[PDB]
Amino acid sequence: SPLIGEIGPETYSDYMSAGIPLAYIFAETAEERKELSDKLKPIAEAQRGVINFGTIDAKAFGAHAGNLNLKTDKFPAFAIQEVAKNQKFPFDQEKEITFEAIKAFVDDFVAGKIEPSIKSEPIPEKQEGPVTVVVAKNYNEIVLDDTKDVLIEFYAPWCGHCKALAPKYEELGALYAKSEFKDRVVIAKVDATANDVPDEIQGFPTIKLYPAGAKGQPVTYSGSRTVEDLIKFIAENGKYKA
């Protein structure tokens, strides 16, 4: 077979089972797949036996990008999968894919210089709006902040009751941002479909209170989902009985 093969249904399990890492090159047309194949060939050459490289059809399989912690719908892209440890190593998708760039990345991977990825939207540069936006990369900082009573909503964009709940959650945040409790209570949400989080979720929405000092016994709301019942909830279960 060709040095840089063709990652798809027939070849995948062979790729997985080979027991070495796999490097995906994502692209929407055959024409671009080739360009890049050739562009990267000398690196694949170097890494024989140590890393498999392959081309993947981003039209037919773009969805698989998310499995590598690459953004859906931003091609062409590149990422390396450590099969054994089940670790993902995406290559920034805003950066251009060039021999010199990839080679550095790869060398750094092989060097064990890169930290394994995580599903996260990027940390927002500003936290404006009354509801704090949690993404995977600040869940700890914000949700597990031991000094704050944290209310967190776990949502899915595509869920109906979540969108129904949205305005009232917004209202509940604006209310606490304007109260005497502003410094110690947090009203936050996270898109659980876009971010890896700790909590095991079963349906959307889900609301939990992580109280200050008891971030091991978070509390699952199962009330009416009205602004006042959720205030009652934070007061009744929060350290600061707000």
3-state secondary structure the chain: CCCCEEECHHHHHHHHHCCCCEEEEEECCHHHHHHHHHHHHHHHHHCCCCCEEEEEEHHHHHHHHHHHCCCCCCCCEEEEEECCCCEEEEECCCCCCCHHHHHHHHHHHHCCCCCCCCCCCCCCCCCCCCCEECCHHHHHHHHCCCCCEEEEEEECCCCHHHHHHHHHHHHHHHHHHCCCCCCCEEEEEEECCCCCCCCCCCCCCEEEEECCCCCCCCEECCCCCCHHHHHHHHHHHCCCCC
Q: What is the CA radius of gyration of the chain?
A: 22
Contact 168, 154 (CB under 8 A): no
d(CA 55, CA 78): 10
Determine which one of 36, 77, 162, 165 is catalytic.
Answer: 162
- If we measure between CA atoms, which residue out of 165, 35, 172 comes closest to residue 96? 35
Ramachandran assignment for 73, one of left (phi > 0), alpha (psi -120 to 50 degrees), beta (any other): left
CATH hierarchy code of domain 1-120: 3.40.30.10
Please answer whether residues 142 and 59 qualify as being in contact, where contact means their C-beta atoms are separated by less than 8 angstroms. no
Query: What is the Cα–Cα distance from 199 to 136, expressed in whole angstroms?
Result: 11
Angle, CA 201 vertex, CA 195 and CA 206 arms, to 5°: 95
Distance separating alpha carbons of residues 176 and 242, to the nearest angstrom? 9
- Phi then psi for residue 119, to 5 deg, are -65, 115
As beta bridge partners, residue 53 has 23
Tell me how the structure was determined.
X-ray
Tell me whether residue 68 is exposed, middle or buried, using C-beta atoms within 10 angstroms of its C-beta: 0 to 12, 13 to 18, 19 or more.
Answer: buried
Q: What angle do CA 146, 175, 199 make, to 5 degrees?
A: 40
Q: Which residues belong to CATH 3.40.30.10 in the chain?
A: 1-120, 121-242
Between strands 185-191 and 52-57, the pairing is unpaired
CATH architecture of 121-242: 3-Layer(aba) Sandwich (3.40)
The residue behind tokens 């989080």 is 197
How are strands ordered across the β-sheet holding 206-210? Answer: 132-133, 185-191, 149-155, 206-210, 219-220
CA–chain centroid gap for 16, Å, is: 23
Which strands sit side by side in the sheet containing 77-82, from one edge to the other? 5-7, 52-57, 22-27, 77-82, 87-91
The CA distance from 206 to 220, in Å, is: 8
> Are the beta carbons of 4 and 55 closer than 8 angstroms?
yes
Nearest to 136 by CA among 118, 159, 157, 114: 118
Query: Computed from CA positions of residues 21, 7, 26, 36, in that sequence, does the dihedral angle turn out positive or negative?
Result: positive
**Rounded Cα distance, 190 and 182, in Å:** 20
Resolution (A): 3.3
Q: How far is CA 103 from CA 35, 91, 95, 98, 133, in A?
A: 16, 11, 13, 8, 36
CB 136 within 8 Å of CB 195 = yes
Residue with tokens 């998708």, as numbered in its chain: 93
Is 211 tagged catalytic?
Answer: no
In terms of Cβ atoms closer than 10 Å to its own Cβ (0-12, 13-18, 19+), residue 222 is exposed
Q: Is 58 a catalytic residue?
A: no
| 101, 110, 114, 159: the active-site residue | 159
Q: What is the rounded distance in angstroms from the CA atom of residue 193 to the CA atom of residue 178?
A: 30
Side-chain half-sphere CA neighbours of 163 within 13 A: 5
